[PDB]
Amino acid sequence: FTSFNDESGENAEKLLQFKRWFWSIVEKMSMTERQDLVYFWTSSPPSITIRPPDDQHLPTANTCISRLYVPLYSSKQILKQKLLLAIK
Secondary structure, eight states: OOEEOSSSSOOHHHHHHHHHHHHHHHHHOOHHHHHEEEEEEESSOOOOEEEEETTTSOOOETTTTTEEEEEOOSSSSHHHHHHHHHOO
């Protein structure tokens, strides 16, 4: 039920690819990682804004509205790394 807001400036094939990468990573998360993710995103134990690409910046959240911000990373590996690093 999560909606995406495209604020990335990037092309549709890149956006679609990134969306696939993201859900793939979330699918493979452990129960502890998923709990850490939901807490990070929502502050409880709907949407994602995809920002322009920046491989040195971590994902952040506006928890008041349950909005995760994630830069459109250049690889699946970088996405996984920075998402796991952000939520822990």
